[PDB]
Amino acid sequence: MEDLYPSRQNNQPKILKRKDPVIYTDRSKDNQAPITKEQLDSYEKNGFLQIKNFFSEDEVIDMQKAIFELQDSIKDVASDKVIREPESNDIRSIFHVHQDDNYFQDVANDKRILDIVRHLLGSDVYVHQSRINYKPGFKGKEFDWHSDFETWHVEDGMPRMRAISVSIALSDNYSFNGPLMLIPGSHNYFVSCVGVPDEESLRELTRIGGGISVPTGKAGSVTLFESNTMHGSTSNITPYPRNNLFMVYNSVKNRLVEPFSGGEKRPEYIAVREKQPVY
Numbered sequence: 211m212e213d214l215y216p217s218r219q220n221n222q223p224k225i226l227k228r229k230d231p232v233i234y235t236d237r238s239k240d241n242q243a244p245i246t247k248e249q250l251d252s253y254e255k256n257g258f259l260q261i262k263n264f265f266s267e268d269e270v271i272d273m274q275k276a277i278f279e280l281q282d283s284i285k286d287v288a289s290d291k292v293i294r295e296p297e298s299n300d301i302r303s304i305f306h307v308h309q310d311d312n313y314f315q316d317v318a319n320d321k322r323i324l325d326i327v328r329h330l331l332g333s334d335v336y337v338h339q340s341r342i343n344y345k346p347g348f349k350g351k352e353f354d355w356h357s358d359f360e361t362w363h364v365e366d367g368m369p370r371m372r373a374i375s376v377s378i379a380l381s382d383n384y385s386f387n388g389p390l391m392l393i394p395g396s397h398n399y400f401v402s403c404v405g406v407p408d409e410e411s412l413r414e415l416t417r418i419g420g421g422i423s424v425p426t427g428k429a430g431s432v433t434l435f436e437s438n439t440m441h442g443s444t445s446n447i448t449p450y451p452r453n454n455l456f457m458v459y460n461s462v463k464n465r466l467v468e469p470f471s472g473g474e475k476r477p478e479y480i481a482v483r484e485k486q487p488v489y
């Protein structure tokens with residue numbers, strides 16, 4: 211397992227080009243994809259794709275009800291998968307719902323999602339991680355810019371950029387309430403950290419990308435983004451919440467090995483190492 215993407219090793223950051231395809235299925239096979247050529251081109255160029263109206267209105271309502279019924283059902287639970295705010299003990303995240311809850315397993319297995327990620331990753335996929343995020347109005351701090359791939363590689367042993375994050379908005383997504391922002395085109399550049407990149411690198415990626423992208427849309431809208439697309443968000447100082455369901459689809463050809471940091475494995479609810487049993 212040669213490290214094609216060393217990071218946190220050198221005390222000096224460096225930008226290296228991408229060594230992996232972005233769209234793994236041949237573009238001559240676009241006809242076979244569940245999304246158009248324009249969508250495919252836009253994913254490839256930008257490192258993300260927003261799809262508004264992915265889910266019907268009843269499905270959105272249902273998912274919104276479901277995350278709050280689950281939150282209530284687990285109020286008394288003691289579990290490292292359940293992230294709570296100290297003081298209020300309010301639940302802010304629940305990991306691994308894709309496996310631990312029937313409803314959310316079905317969402318994670320939604321054919322609409324699987325058909326896209328399988329085409330983009332040019333193989334079958336499995337869920338690397340899932341989480342429900344509860345972000346009430348006025349809650350949730352800033353998250354500095356980062357590449358998920360950098361973390362998955364160094365800390366979880368993901369060898370190659372062959373995963374896709376899928377974010378389902380379960381609250382209306384506005385410009386002003388701390389939405390997810392992304393640097394378009396940044397997926398094509400690996401920023402080796404000395405894992406939050408420095409201002410100079412971010413300036414360089416922004417310049418190349420031409421700007422900053424901020425998908426917005428009503429609850430139910432979906433944003434897919436490539437493993438190495440740089441993203442981040444401001445705090446929310448508004449009463450508009452930002453609840454979401456987040457899943458990561460990894461290619462079955464890119465299963466985790468030991469962390470490239472040389473460090474210990476993180477828990478299964480953070481990074482899946484189970485292989486699906488045949489039964």
Ligand SMILES: [Fe+3]
Pocket residue numbers: 356357358441
């Ligand atoms: Fe992230």
